[PDB]
């Protein structure tokens, strides 16, 4: 038993024989034989990578990272299981596991593993902004892809870049070229890619303002997965889809997401900030404000709370202080929106609309737009701006 | 034996002084390369401009025939064949270009093979036979060595970005281009520079930076005598002035129209733009096409009736047009005309929506100006154009 997971399992089985049939059903097996094999013989893998992930999530939930790191670094890089490990690591944003698997798969002599390694490396580089979308497609081309799996993943990696540049027409063009039924042997990879695609589509529809479609895609993703990363982003999207229409559903979706985020500080932050904004926008008591942070976004949330409490003079002073510092366009939109709530000047709301339009934020633009309608501006013309 | 060499030998027999005339027009300090070109099969000039300039000067009416024949018998492995390929693509001489492409991918010379493969990707992307992602993937597959094709592969992607109206990735590719890396091929460097100035010109025309637009179009005009680039540069300058200065718009279109002489297709762009310009500024219009069955021309007829307060005839011809199939840009214009006839705000609002849906940041100004006249808030109208 070289791998940490095999050591723990043999140990726990010595104390409790009934675990064997428990772990068999949790892994999806009709019969426990592959599990006897896994425990006894070095290098014996399950046919599907979900078998081991499920056993680890169930029996050692607190120890997932340590156990999976050790298990992945000990896999034969030439196998289906190592190729599945690479997807698992990237999905969970376990970049240390992933980068080690990538380097050793590019080295190996197996054609399949080499190609997956080279393609995931392109995805890593594009994510980090070390290359742009055109260098990335050029590298995809250089590689002369053979597998149906990497044919699909090369399209998805380009979609990720298109998503974070807010450029949706080319995303849909790439989506159209994907056919998941061509993944014939690797059911773990097919299911994981399907989860990725449902999340991506969810974010598309959220920006194109089809709120119903957005929620349906986010739910499809939630149903298909137990990966923390995808659960977190799906609930974040659902929360956001409700901001303007239903305080209570927005909040509860953020709280469910926050619970799934437990023990990842970075994921937890997204929910705290969104909750802070939500509670301010709907004039509710706000437990989420960060009074210590000197990041612009957080300091704006403190101004917004002063405004809800009719402390207009203090809000104005902190807002003038912020004007001194460098702000991008999205922050300036928010800045002028707050100024408008204090002073009731139409000009501030107009500037706010301009800044949000210039920064390509199709969500926050609704805030000064709602105010301008309240001040008697023409609804028919306001609607045209959001198109 | 090339037709151009036959004509030149013939004209030289009658006039010995042509030799020194053709030498200076070709940019050579000394006539030797020209004696060589006439006498020995396969001898090329160092620069492709040499032969283009001789042909433009001595046989202006025969450019297409002479250049077609010359290019089809070139040594495909040479600098001159690589320059021919640029010349043909710039002029949209697709016959010449496709023949050079096929025979350059055949040859064993690494440089010519790479140019051929890269121009072929440009041709395929233009025709919509592939999308922008297949095109970059093919660029990658090729393993490009030359600095020339490194640059041109970026420009071919710019062309596709332009036709899809997505300008941010164009600018990203523009920033990666450095023309001083083209060390040896002066003809190609100058031609690529022309292409880039035209592309930037059209960017800024859509992003409403009108002064930048004109400056780039002028830079292109200064650098070129290719009729295609002259025509599109003047068309762009004309268009940049539509809303702000009738007279400069008109004069820029008339200079463009003169450069278009003897290409009916190019001439049409100017006639239609002139027709629109005169209608928009309520001037007597000599440019109307009463015979054309194109939507855009039939709209110009309606617009003229409206300027003459012939409202009931305009209404009848407008109802006729509504029956027929129209894209969004035409529908914008359709509802604008309806609004001028009926004075309904609804028609102007729809007009704005159709122009916004069709990504036309210019024509949208027309119903916007009307809405301001009807008392809608100018401050909010300005945001819709931005």
Residue A317 belongs to what domain range? 296-386
Please name the residue of chain A whose CA is at the shortest distance from the CA of residue B345: A380
Please name the residue of chain A whose CA is at the shortest distance from the CA of residue B161: A170
Instruction: Tell me if A225 is assigned to some domain.
Output: no
Instruction: Tell me if A318 is assigned to some domain.
Output: yes
Contact between chains at A169 and B173 (C-beta distance less than 8 A) = no
Contact between chains at B168 and A167 (C-beta distance less than 8 A) = yes
CA distances from B101 to A72, B78, B106, B139 (A): 50, 13, 9, 16
- State this model's resolution in angstroms: 2.4
Crossing angle of helices A168-175/A148-164, nearest 10°? 170
Read off φ and ψ for residue A77, nearest 5 degrees: -60, -20
Q: Quick one: CA dihedral B340, B343, B344, B346, positive or negative?
A: positive
Chosen for mutation from A346, A359, A365, A381 (greatest number of chain B CBs closer than 10 Å) is: A381
Residue B274: both structure tokens together: 């002139």
CA–centroid distance for B179 within its chain: 21
Please, what is the end-to-end C-alpha distance for chain A in angstroms?
Answer: 61
Q: Can you tell me whether residue A33 is helix, strand or coil? A: helix
Instruction: Tell me if A305 is assigned to some domain.
Output: yes
Instruction: Tell me if A215 is assigned to some domain.
Output: no
Crossing angle of helices B18-25/B32-39, nearest 10°? 110
Closest approach of chain B CAs to the CA of A385, in angstroms?
6
Listed in order, strand segments (DSSP E) in chain B are none
Instruction: Tell me if A241 is assigned to some domain.
Output: no
**Of B132, B137, B376, Cβ closest to residue A141:** B137
Contact between chains at A137 and B140 (C-beta distance less than 8 A) = yes
Separation between Cα atoms, residue B313 and residue B320, nearest integer Å: 11
Please name the residue of chain A whose CA is at the shortest distance from the CA of residue B130: A173
Separation between Cα atoms, residue B128 and residue B160, nearest integer Å: 9
CB neighbourhood size of A43 (10 A): 11
| Contacting residues of A for B353, CB less than 8 Å apart | 384, 387
Contact between chains at A381 and B386 (C-beta distance less than 8 A) = no
CB A103 within 8 A of CB A97: no
CB B192 within 8 A of CB B174: no
Separation between Cα atoms, residue A299 and residue A17, nearest integer Å: 57
| Contacting residues of B for A173, CB less than 8 Å apart | 131, 133
Separation between Cα atoms, residue B251 and residue B268, nearest integer Å: 16
Residues of B in CB contact (< 8 Å) with A are 131-133, 136-143, 154, 157, 164, 166, 168-169, 172-173, 349, 352-353, 356-357, 376-377, 379-381, 383-384, 386
Contact between chains at B376 and A377 (C-beta distance less than 8 A) = no
Separation between Cα atoms, residue A360 and residue A187, nearest integer Å: 38
Instruction: Tell me if A97 is assigned to some domain.
Output: no
A59-87 core/surface letters (b: 16 or more CB in 10 A; e: else): bbeeeeeebbbbbbeebebbebbbbbbbb
Separation between Cα atoms, residue B348 and residue B373, nearest integer Å: 11
CB neighbourhood size of B226 (10 A): 18
Q: Residue B76: name the closest of B32, B107, B119 by CA.
A: B107
Separation between Cα atoms, residue B243 and residue B178, nearest integer Å: 35
Residue B85: both structure tokens together: 């390929």
Please name the residue of chain B whose CA is at the shortest distance from the CA of residue A372: B380
Read off φ and ψ for residue B161, nearest 5 degrees: -55, -45
Contact between chains at A138 and B133 (C-beta distance less than 8 A) = no
CA distances from B330 to A19, A103, B98, B296 (A): 72, 56, 35, 7
CB A239 within 8 A of CB A215: no
Contact between chains at A378 and B377 (C-beta distance less than 8 A) = yes
Q: Residue A328: name the closest of A293, A362, A359 by CA.
A: A359
Closest approach of chain A CAs to the CA of B97, in angstroms?
25
Residue A87: both structure tokens together: 């997807």
CB neighbourhood size of B190 (10 A): 16
| Contacting residues of B for A350, CB less than 8 Å apart | 379-380, 383
| Contacting residues of B for A144, CB less than 8 Å apart | 141
Separation between Cα atoms, residue A363 and residue A356, nearest integer Å: 9
CB A198 within 8 A of CB A221: yes
Instruction: Tell me if A372 is assigned to some domain.
Output: yes
Contact between chains at B133 and A137 (C-beta distance less than 8 A) = yes
Please name the residue of chain A whose CA is at the shortest distance from the CA of residue B356: A387
Per-residue DSSP letter, A362: T
Please name the residue of chain B whose CA is at the shortest distance from the CA of residue A354: B383
Separation between Cα atoms, residue A311 and residue B11, nearest integer Å: 93
- Which positions ≥6 away from B205 have C-beta within 8 Å? B213, B236, B239, B240, B362
Read off φ and ψ for residue B190, nearest 5 degrees: -65, -40
| Contacting residues of B for A387, CB less than 8 Å apart | 353, 356-357
- Which positions ≥6 away from A42 have C-beta within 8 Å? A2
| Contacting residues of B for A152, CB less than 8 Å apart | none
Cβ burial of A234 (10 Å; 0-12, 13-18, 19+) is: buried
Domain count, chain A: 1
What is the rounded radius of gyration, in angstroms, for the C-alpha atoms of chain B? 25
Residues in chain B: 386
| Contacting residues of B for A174, CB less than 8 Å apart | 133
| Contacting residues of B for A380, CB less than 8 Å apart | 349
| Contacting residues of A for B380, CB less than 8 Å apart | 350, 372, 377-378, 381-382, 385
CB B68 within 8 A of CB B55: no
Please name the residue of chain B whose CA is at the shortest distance from the CA of residue A141: B137
Instruction: Tell me if A377 is assigned to some domain.
Output: yes
Question: Phi-psi bin for B325: left (phi > 0), alpha (psi -120 to 50), beta?
Answer: beta
Contact between chains at A382 and B380 (C-beta distance less than 8 A) = yes
| Contacting residues of B for A167, CB less than 8 Å apart | 166, 168-169
Please, what is the end-to-end C-alpha distance for chain B in angstroms?
Answer: 59
Per-residue DSSP letter, B74: S
CB B155 within 8 A of CB B133: no
Separation between Cα atoms, residue A347 and residue A224, nearest integer Å: 48
**Of B131, B137, B386, Cβ closest to residue A354:** B386
CB neighbourhood size of B183 (10 A): 9
A116-151 core/surface letters (b: 16 or more CB in 10 A; e: else): bbbbbbbbbbbbeeebbbbbbbbbbbbbebebbbbb
Q: DSSP 3-state helix, strand, coil percentages of chain B (rounded to 5)?
A: 75, 0, 25
- Which positions ≥6 away from A325 have C-beta within 8 Å? A296
CA distances from A189 to A90, A95, B310 (A): 12, 18, 69
């Amino acid at each position: 038993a070289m791998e940490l997971i095999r050591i723990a399992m043999k140990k726990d089985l010595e104390n409790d024989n009934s675990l064997m049939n428990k772990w068999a059903t949790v892994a999806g097996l009709k019969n426990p034989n592959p599990l006897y094999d896994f425990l006894n013989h070095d290098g014996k893998t399950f046919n599907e990578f979900s078998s081991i992930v499920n056993i680890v999530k169930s029996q050692y939930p607190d120890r997932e990272y340590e156990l999976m790191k050790d298990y992945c670094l000990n896999l034969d890089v030439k196998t289906k299981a190592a190729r599945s490990a690479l997807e698992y690591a990237d999905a969970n944003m376990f970049f240390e596991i992933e980068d080690a698997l990538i380097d050793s798969m590019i080295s190996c002599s197996n054609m399949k593993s080499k190609e997956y390694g080279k393609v995931y490396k392109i995805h890593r580089e594009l994510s980090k902004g070390e290359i742009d979308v055109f260098e990335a497609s050029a590298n995809i081309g250089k590689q002369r892809i053979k597998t149906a799996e990497m044919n699909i993943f090369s399209k998805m990696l380009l979609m990720y870049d298109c998503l974070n540049k807010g450029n949706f027409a080319p995303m849909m063009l790439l989506f159209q070229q994907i056919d998941l039924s061509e993944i014939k042997e690797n059911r773990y990879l097919k299911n994981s890619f399907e989860t990725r695609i449902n999340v991506l589509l969810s974010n598309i529809y959220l920006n194109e303002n089809n709120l119903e479609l957005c929620r349906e895609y986010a739910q499809k993703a939630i149903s298909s997965t137990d990966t923390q990363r995808f659960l977190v982003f799906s609930y974040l999207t659902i929360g956001t889809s409700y901001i303007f229409s239903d305080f209570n559903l927005s909040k509860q979706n953020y709280l469910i997401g926050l619970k799934f985020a437990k023990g990842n500080p970075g994921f937890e932050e997204f929910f705290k900030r969104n909750l802070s904004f939500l509670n301010n926008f709907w004039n509710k008591e706000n437990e989420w404000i960060n009074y210590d942070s000197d990041a612009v976004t957080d300091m704006q949330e403190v101004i917004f709370e002063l405004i809800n409490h009719k402390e207009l003079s203090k809000a104005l002073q902190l807002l003038n202080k912020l004007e001194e510092r460098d702000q991008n366009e999205n922050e300036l939109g928010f800045h002028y929106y707050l100024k408008g709530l204090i002073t009731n000047e139409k000009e501030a709301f107009f500037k706010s609309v301009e800044y949000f339009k210039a920064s390509q934020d199709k969500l926050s633009i609704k805030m000064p737009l709602i105010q301008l309608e309240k001040m008697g501006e023409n609804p028919r013309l306001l609607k045209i701006i959001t198109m």
